Each structure stands twice: as structure tokens, then as C-alpha cells.
Scaffold this active site. Structure first.
Site, PDB file in Angstrom:
ATOM      1  N   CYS A   1      -4.701 -36.350  -7.141  1.00 17.68           N
ATOM      2  CA  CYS A   1      -5.087 -34.939  -7.167  1.00 17.68           C
ATOM      3  C   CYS A   1      -3.865 -34.034  -7.199  1.00 17.68           C
ATOM      4  CB  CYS A   1      -5.954 -34.606  -5.944  1.00 17.68           C
ATOM      5  SG  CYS A   1      -6.580 -32.898  -5.963  1.00 17.68           S
TER       6      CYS A   1
ATOM      7  N   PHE B   1      -7.697 -38.186  -2.291  1.00 14.56           N
ATOM      8  CA  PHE B   1      -7.068 -37.425  -3.362  1.00 14.56           C
ATOM      9  C   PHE B   1      -6.533 -38.365  -4.446  1.00 14.56           C
ATOM     10  CE2 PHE B   1      -6.943 -34.465   0.309  1.00 14.56           C
ATOM     11  CZ  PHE B   1      -7.598 -33.369  -0.257  1.00 14.56           C
TER      12      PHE B   1
ATOM     13  N   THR C   1     -15.466 -30.334  -5.456  1.00 13.75           N
ATOM     14  CA  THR C   1     -14.718 -31.134  -4.490  1.00 13.75           C
ATOM     15  C   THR C   1     -14.440 -30.329  -3.222  1.00 13.75           C
ATOM     16  OG1 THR C   1     -12.741 -30.514  -5.759  1.00 13.75           O
ATOM     17  CG2 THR C   1     -13.604 -32.744  -6.045  1.00 13.75           C
TER      18      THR C   1
HETATM   19  C1  HEM Z   1      -8.730 -26.150  -6.035  1.00 15.98           C
HETATM   20  C2  HEM Z   1      -8.822 -27.444  -5.714  1.00 15.98           C
HETATM   21  C3  HEM Z   1      -8.447 -28.614  -6.650  1.00 15.98           C
HETATM   22  C4  HEM Z   1      -7.887 -28.619  -7.873  1.00 15.98           C
HETATM   23  C5  HEM Z   1      -7.292 -27.434  -8.660  1.00 15.98           C
HETATM   24  C6  HEM Z   1      -7.844 -30.005  -8.322  1.00 15.98           C
HETATM   25  C7  HEM Z   1      -7.319 -30.467  -9.513  1.00 15.98           C
HETATM   26  C8  HEM Z   1      -7.218 -31.786  -9.913  1.00 15.98           C
HETATM   27  C9  HEM Z   1      -6.630 -32.275 -11.149  1.00 15.98           C
HETATM   28  C10 HEM Z   1      -6.034 -31.408 -12.288  1.00 15.98           C
HETATM   29  C11 HEM Z   1      -6.755 -33.612 -11.150  1.00 15.98           C
HETATM   30  C12 HEM Z   1      -6.258 -34.593 -12.222  1.00 15.98           C
HETATM   31  C13 HEM Z   1      -4.772 -34.853 -11.948  1.00 15.98           C
HETATM   32  C14 HEM Z   1      -4.135 -35.757 -13.004  1.00 15.98           C
HETATM   33  O1  HEM Z   1      -4.722 -36.770 -13.493  1.00 15.98           O
HETATM   34  O2  HEM Z   1      -3.022 -35.383 -13.462  1.00 15.98           O
HETATM   35  C15 HEM Z   1      -7.347 -34.021  -9.894  1.00 15.98           C
HETATM   36  C16 HEM Z   1      -7.622 -35.317  -9.530  1.00 15.98           C
HETATM   37  C17 HEM Z   1      -8.343 -35.688  -8.415  1.00 15.98           C
HETATM   38  N1  HEM Z   1      -8.784 -34.859  -7.400  1.00 15.98           N
HETATM   39 FE1  HEM Z   1      -8.524 -32.892  -7.335  1.00 15.98          FE
HETATM   40  N2  HEM Z   1      -8.417 -30.800  -7.359  1.00 15.98           N
HETATM   41  C18 HEM Z   1      -8.839 -29.973  -6.327  1.00 15.98           C
HETATM   42  C19 HEM Z   1      -9.510 -30.367  -5.160  1.00 15.98           C
HETATM   43  C20 HEM Z   1      -9.871 -31.660  -4.819  1.00 15.98           C
HETATM   44  C21 HEM Z   1     -10.510 -32.102  -3.571  1.00 15.98           C
HETATM   45  C22 HEM Z   1     -10.959 -31.175  -2.403  1.00 15.98           C
HETATM   46  C23 HEM Z   1     -10.652 -33.436  -3.683  1.00 15.98           C
HETATM   47  C24 HEM Z   1     -11.228 -34.478  -2.736  1.00 15.98           C
HETATM   48  C25 HEM Z   1     -11.696 -34.160  -1.538  1.00 15.98           C
HETATM   49  C26 HEM Z   1     -10.094 -33.871  -4.927  1.00 15.98           C
HETATM   50  C27 HEM Z   1     -10.068 -35.180  -5.324  1.00 15.98           C
HETATM   51  C28 HEM Z   1      -9.461 -35.640  -6.476  1.00 15.98           C
HETATM   52  C29 HEM Z   1      -9.436 -37.025  -6.937  1.00 15.98           C
HETATM   53  C30 HEM Z   1     -10.055 -38.263  -6.235  1.00 15.98           C
HETATM   54  C31 HEM Z   1      -8.759 -37.037  -8.084  1.00 15.98           C
HETATM   55  C32 HEM Z   1      -8.498 -38.284  -8.909  1.00 15.98           C
HETATM   56  C33 HEM Z   1      -9.711 -38.378  -9.796  1.00 15.98           C
HETATM   57  C34 HEM Z   1      -9.701 -39.640 -10.592  1.00 15.98           C
HETATM   58  O3  HEM Z   1      -8.973 -40.622 -10.233  1.00 15.98           O
HETATM   59  O4  HEM Z   1     -10.449 -39.632 -11.600  1.00 15.98           O
HETATM   60  N3  HEM Z   1      -9.652 -32.771  -5.622  1.00 15.98           N
HETATM   61  N4  HEM Z   1      -7.641 -32.878  -9.183  1.00 15.98           N
END
Ligand code: HEM
Length: 462
Positions: free
Chosen positions: A403, A396, A269
Site C-alpha cells: 500500500c 497493507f 479500505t
Molecule cells: C487514502 C488511503 C489509501 C490510498 C490512497 C491507497 C492507495 C493504494 C495504492 C495506489 C495501492 C497500489 C500500490 C502499488 O501497487 O504500487 C495500494 C495497495 C494496497 N492497499 Fe492501499 N490505499 C489506501 C488505504 C488502504 C487501507 C486503509 C488499506 C488496508 C486496511 C489498504 C490496503 C492495501 C493493500 C492490501 C494493498 C495491496 C493490494 C494488492 O496486493 O492487490 N489501503 N493502496
């Protein structure tokens, strides 16, 4: 009452609707369809199932109501769970460890927590810059070096382990196993029913890869539980912290799952966001000029930034916000109907039916974005940000399942860009033609640029 059939394209005599799933990035096929269908959602027949795509901002507001639709592992996240376990990304809301991890980890991922990680992000960012210094004139492999950046950063902040991905070409075995397992996980989401001899062996090596990863992380964990129990990093926090609701700590299994999750959900991501941003800056060089001006204003000479420097940025954050509007790297995540639902007063969504949010089409919907195909960072000033459609910007995710890594990601990217533009003149020697590849994430592929040290008289400010 009086329902309407969800719009559906006319279908192909040989392929049915399956031709929409072909290519390096089928979400772009969905985007073109969406541009033909103004009702804001459509329907495809994929072999057995129904695929539904939604991009109308008001419909998406409805699909965002967690009383009516929710993220469900149910089936769509099942293979990625092979390595995520009941970590935050791959667990259902009702599983106790989701709530536990969520409440434990949120304070560790908030903005005020980011200063605690800065030195670690900076350590990795400087190593990136070092490599690019060392190889000036040679092709920079942008996607590749951004993946190094984000893997090392999330690994250092996550469990204090230094993979040193910029010292060598070949990645550490743990990361090669991660890469192999991720690729194979997306392969399992398709492929044919009867397995041939190559595929069985590939499954065996896949579960083996996962074991090797679990082993390394487990080893770090046991071996932190002896002496100590917390050296600042996220692991140290998960070793001590208790859930303020149940009074319980996270199990060791679940801690390893969370570490794996940070890697699953954080590297492609964030590296995607960064690669797309360098692409967008190469294609909108006036924006790049403004960013160079900001960098020279805040970091004259070889000044080393602090977290305060990052928080004093304005142009670079808004660049990132708009890059995520053009090229959000998880572009088609889906919600599941809790009950039979009717959205738009017209369209039925049956209990258990998935509806995908078609993020590129939503992020560019003309009803919500003036001149949607125009890259414009002024959309993101405090004043103009306030006037956006509240359901038309979801890079996010949504609701409780949003996120948790957002602030980490954005900090990491702000800092990387700051340091890169401090040192380097960017150059495009091959007329890069954007080629997007879709797996869990989307990402620019085969994107090379060249960099040259900025000379002192080439900086702005006096
Ligand atoms: C070091 C960077 C990141 C970490 C540690 C991280 C971690 C996570 C975690 C643990 C979740 C699940 C949260 C939950 O359900 O409780 C999540 C969801 C999500 N993240 Fe991140 N994330 C990061 C970067 C990014 C970036 C750069 C993007 C988008 C540009 C992103 C987009 C999303 C999206 C769309 C979800 C929801 C996914 C879904 O609905 O299935 N993440 N992230």
C-alpha cells in the site's frame, strides 16, 4: 522431491466446492475452513480453475518472496483495471508507468509528507463532526458517513476538489458514478455467459459512468495545466515531478488514472477500517475508555489538533493496528507463481498458479499470535511489536506492491477518531449484530450508532 497434495475439503454432492463462494462475504467461509485445516493452506475447485488459500506464517513468508511470487493483474485485477488503467493498483510491475508513478509518488506518501495534508484531512474531519453535532440522537449511518469522510478527504488531497458530501444526503454525481461502476466491476467478476437485455444496457451505462468520471478528472487536469501547475495537492505534484530514473513526467492519461486509483484504493479500505474500529470499540469498551483518556489528555476543551497532536497519540494508533489485525479490509489479495515453486518443502505451486493470502486466518494464526481471538492493543507497543512473526501481519500488502497510501490512511483515521471521541459519547441502541459485506473490500453493513455531545464535567484531566 517427495511432494504432498495440497489439502482439500471433501466437496458437496450438488454444489461441489461452490457453496464456499456463497453469501455476503465468502472470505469468512475460507476462514472457517482454514480453522479446520492445520497444514496452513488448502485447495478448492471453482468451476474451471483451482483456488488456493494460504495462512501458515512460514508458507506466507515464502509466498511473500518477490523472487518467487508476485502480484499479477494477470486475470484477477482485469475488471477493476477498466477504471484503474495503468495506475499503481491495476498495472503490472513491468509496465513502465508503474515504475514511473511509484518512484514519483512515494515521496508524496511518506510520513514526512503527511503534515502537508493535515489541514485538508482536518477540514473534512470537522465537517463530519459538524454533521454528527447537527443530528445528535438520530441514527448515525457509520459506513455511509465514513465513506463520505474518506472520499472527500482523498478528493481534496488528491486533486483539490471539494465534493462537500456532508452538506447533503445525495452524493455528488461523480461519486454516484464511482459507486455504480465499483459495484458493477465486482458483478463482472461472476455472472453467467449469455447476457440478457438488462445486462447489455447495464454494460453501456457502466462504460458511460466511467467516461463521465474520466471527463471530470481530465477537465480538472487540462484546466490546472492552464495557469499554474501545482497547488500543494497530489495532482500538482504529478504535473511537475519527473521520474529520477527516466527523466520523464507522467502523461495526462496516467495522471487521471492515478487520481481514479486514489479513489478506488483509498475510500472503502479506509472507511472500512474506521467503521470496524468504531464497532470494535463498542465491543471492547475498556479500550474505548483508554482512548477517551488519551483524547482528553491531548485535546482539553474544544482544542483543535495539529499534525503534532496526531503524532503524539499512542492508544489510538495501537487500536488501529489491532483493528486491522481483526478486520483487515482487503482480506484475500493474491500472488502469482513466477516459476514452478515448492513451498513448505512439500507443496507444488505451478507457474502462473495464484495463491491467495487468507489474511483473517493469517492475522489470527495461533503459531504467530498468543490468544489470537482476543482484542489486545498492547500487542502493538514498540517493544511487543518487535516480537511478531515477520510474515503474519500484512494489512497493507507486501513488497514493492505494498500500500502506498498506508500513511495517509492511518493519519486520516487517527485524526477522525481523535475528533470524534473528543466530541461524542458513543451509544449502541440496536445491539448491532456484525454483518460483513465483501466486494473489493470488507465492511460492516447496516451499522447504526447514536452520539451525544460530551459535557465538560464528563472529560478527564484537570
Ligand atoms: C487514502 C488511503 C489509501 C490510498 C490512497 C491507497 C492507495 C493504494 C495504492 C495506489 C495501492 C497500489 C500500490 C502499488 O501497487 O504500487 C495500494 C495497495 C494496497 N492497499 Fe492501499 N490505499 C489506501 C488505504 C488502504 C487501507 C486503509 C488499506 C488496508 C486496511 C489498504 C490496503 C492495501 C493493500 C492490501 C494493498 C495491496 C493490494 C494488492 O496486493 O492487490 N489501503 N493502496
Amino acid at each position: 522431491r517427495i511432494l504432498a497434495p495440497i489439502p482439500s475439503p471433501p466437496k458437496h454432492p450438488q454444489y461441489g466446492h461452490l457453496h464456499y463462494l456463497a453469501g455476503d462475504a465468502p472470505v469468512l467461509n475460507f476462514f472457517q475452513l482454514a480453522r479446520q485445516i492445520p497444514e496452513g493452506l488448502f485447495q478448492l475447485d471453482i468451476q474451471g480453475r483451482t483456488l488456493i488459500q494460504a495462512y501458515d506464517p512460514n508458507l506466507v513468508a515464502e509466498l511473500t518472496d518477490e523472487r518467487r511470487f508476485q502480484k499479477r493483474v494477470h486475470p484477477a485485477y482485469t475488471n477493476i483495471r477498466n477504471l484503474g488503467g495503468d495506475g499503481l493498483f491495476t498495472s503490472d510491475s513491468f509496465e513502465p508507468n508503474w515504475g514511473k508513478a511509484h518512484r514519483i509518488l512515494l515521496p508524496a506518501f511518506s510520513q514526512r509528507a503527511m503534515k502537508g495534508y493535515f489541514g485538508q484531512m482536518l477540514e473534512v474531519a470537522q465537517a463530519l463532526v459538524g454533521k454528527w453535532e447537527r443530528t445528535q440522537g438520530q441514527d448515525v449511518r457509520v459506513a455511509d458517513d465514513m465513506t463520505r469522510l474518506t472520499l472527500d478527504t482523498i478528493s481534496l488531497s488528491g486533486f483539490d476538489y471539494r465534493f462537500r458530501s456532508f452538506d447533503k444526503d445525495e452524493l455528488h454525481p461523480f461519486l454516484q458514478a464511482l459507486a455504480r461502476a465499483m459495484h458493477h466491476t465486482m458483478t463482472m467478476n461472476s455472472r453467467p455467459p449469455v447476457l440478457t437485455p438488462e445486462m447489455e444496457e447495464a454494460d453501456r451505462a457502466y462504460w458511460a459512468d466511467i467516461a463521465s468520471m474520466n471527463e471530470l478528472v481530465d477537465e480538472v487536469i487540462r484546466e490546472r495545466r492552464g495557469h499554474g501547475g501545482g497547488g500543494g495537492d497530489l495532482l500538482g505534484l504529478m504535473l511537475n515531478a519527473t521520474d529520477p530514473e527516466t527523466g520523464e513526467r507522467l502523461s495526462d492519461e496516467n495522471i487521471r488514472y492515478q487520481v481514479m486509483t486514489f479513489l478506488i484504493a483509498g475510500h472503502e479500505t479506509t472507511s472500512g477500517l474506521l467503521a470496524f474500529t468504531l464497532y470494535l470499540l463498542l465491543r471492547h469498551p475498556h479500550v474505548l475508555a483508554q482512548a477517551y483518556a488519551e483524547v482528553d489528555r491531548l485535546l482539553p476543551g474544544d482544542a483543535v489538533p495539529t499534525y503534532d497532536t496526531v503524532m503524539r497519540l499512542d492508544v489510538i494508533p495501537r487500536i488501529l493496528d489491532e483493528a486491522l489485525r481483526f478486520w483487515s479490509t482487503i482480506p484475500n489479495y493474491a500472488v502469482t507463481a513466477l516459476q514452478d515453486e515448492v513451498i513448505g518443502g512439500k507443496y507444488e505451486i505451478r507457474k502462473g498458479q495464484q495463491v491467495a493470502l487468507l489474511i483473517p486466518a493469517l492475522h489470527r494464526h495461533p503459531a504467530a499470535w498468543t490468544n489470537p481471538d482476543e482484542f489486545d492493543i498492547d500487542r502493538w507497543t514498540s517493544e511487543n511489536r518487535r516480537t511478531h512473526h515477520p510474515a503474519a501481519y500484512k494489512p497493507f500488502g507486501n513488497g514493492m506492491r505494498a500500500c502506498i497510501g498506508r500513511q495517509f490512511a492511518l493519519t486520516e483515521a487517527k485524526l477522525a477518531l481523535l475528533l470524534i471521541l473528543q466530541k461524542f459519547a458513543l451509544s449502541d441502541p440496536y445491539d448491532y449484530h456484525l454483518k460483513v459485506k465483501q466486494s473489493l473490500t470488507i465492511k460492516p453493513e447496516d451499522f447504526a450508532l447514536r452520539v451525544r455531545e460530551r459535557r465538560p464535567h464528563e472529560r478527564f484531566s484537570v
